[PDB]
Design a protein around this ligand. Structure first.
Ligand SMILES: Cc1ncc(C(F)(F)F)c2nc(CCc3nc(N4CCCC4)nn3C)nn12
Ligand SMILES: [Mg+2]
Ligand SMILES: [Zn+2]
Length: 313
């Protein structure tokens, strides 16, 4: 009740910035998450005992893959924290509650393979969920963990509040399917530019929360260059294992997933920052101006990838 989570001074100041790295000490990540809920939501949003048990069951359901792991979950949640704290007054209490949980949960039980590989392998999850296969799985795992004894962090909510928050989390987790991002950002771009964008329209809110999810999900491109560059090595460690598995099924992988195209990595990054990252953070900055430091950091990392190609990095 009278209990506040605190952090050492360098973490207490730097956790408020978009470019914070949560560090290599795994055992601090739960306390960092609770810290962020307490400040973005309040010490009253969740029963501590339930939240702690929820966080630990979530952790235990992330797998030790190179990229889609528990460290990614807490990272994606820290970027959401930064966005929420810089746009305090645009979001409901349910949204604040819902989005940090959504982010912590958004890759639950990820196996290090894309929707496309599950569909080519004919994994049972691809018969249960024909599109956004892992993302429907992640929400399904979130509901499982919420239904364990002593894990319903939302038990204090009304039936209708409970249903709204699970609906926010579902839509937020689905939006992390990058196949959906392109159309979502296009609509948002057109709505912002024609001035039709209306934050009282629930279906507009949805699209805006969807774009925030894509921004948080991609936030490795918004970090200090060494973090960005070393995360890219984890990302490719997964993509190249997937490429190997595609070849095992007798299918030439796309170049992104082929370890034989290691040398094209710099140009593949440029394509990615130009086709995905920069547009994502541009539109987000138009809609929520205090998120500009994510766009400014993305453009700095693009220019670091340009330096690598020129031989200067
Ligand atoms: C930094 C980052 N964050 C998130 C994601 C993701 F979308 F997947 F979440 C992501 N994907 C990639 C991969 C980019 C990429 N490499 C390549 N090839 C072509 C041949 C050499 C490399 N083609 N392309 C488009 N980087 N990356
Ligand atoms: Mg995902
Ligand atoms: Zn993710």
């Amino acid at each position: 009740g009278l209990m506040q989570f605190t952090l050492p001074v360098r973490l207490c100041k730097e956790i408020e910035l978009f470019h914070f790295d949560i560090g290599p000490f795994e055992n601090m990540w739960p306390g960092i998450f609770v810290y962020m809920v307490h400040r973005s939501c309040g010490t009253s949003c969740f029963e501590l005992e339930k939240l702690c048990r929820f966080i630990m069951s979530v952790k235990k359901n992330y797998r030790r893959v190179p990229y889609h792991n528990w460290k990614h979950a807490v990272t994606v949640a820290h970027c959401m924290y930064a966005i929420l704290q810089n746009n305090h007054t645009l979001f409901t209490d349910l949204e604040r509650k819902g989005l940090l949980i959504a982010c912590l949960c958004h890759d639950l039980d990820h196996r290090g393979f894309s929707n496309s590989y599950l569909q080519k392998f004919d994994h049972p999850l691809a018969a249960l969920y024909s599109t956004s296969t892992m993302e429907q799985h992640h929400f399904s795992q979130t509901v499982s963990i919420l239904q364990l004894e002593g894990h319903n962090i939302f038990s204090t909510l009304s039936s209708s509040e409970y249903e709204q928050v699970l609906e926010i989390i579902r839509k937020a987790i689905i939006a992390t399917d990058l196949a959906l991002y392109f159309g979502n950002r296009k609509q948002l771009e057109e709505m912002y530019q024609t001035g039709s964008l209306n934050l009282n329209n629930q279906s507009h809110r949805d699209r805006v929360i969807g774009l925030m999810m894509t921004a948080c999900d991609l936030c490795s491109v918004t970090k200090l260059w060494p973090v960005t560059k070393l995360t890219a090595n984890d990302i490719y460690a997964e993509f190249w294992a997937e490429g190997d598995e595609m070849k095992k099924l007798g299918i030439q992988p796309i170049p992104m997933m082929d370890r034989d195209k290691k040398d094209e990595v710099p140009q593949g990054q440029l394509g990615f920052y130009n086709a995905v990252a920069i547009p994502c953070y541009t539109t987000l900055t138009q809609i929520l101006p205090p998120t500009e430091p994510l766009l400014k950091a993305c453009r700095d990392n693009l220019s670091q990838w340009e330096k690598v190609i020129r031989g200067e990095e």
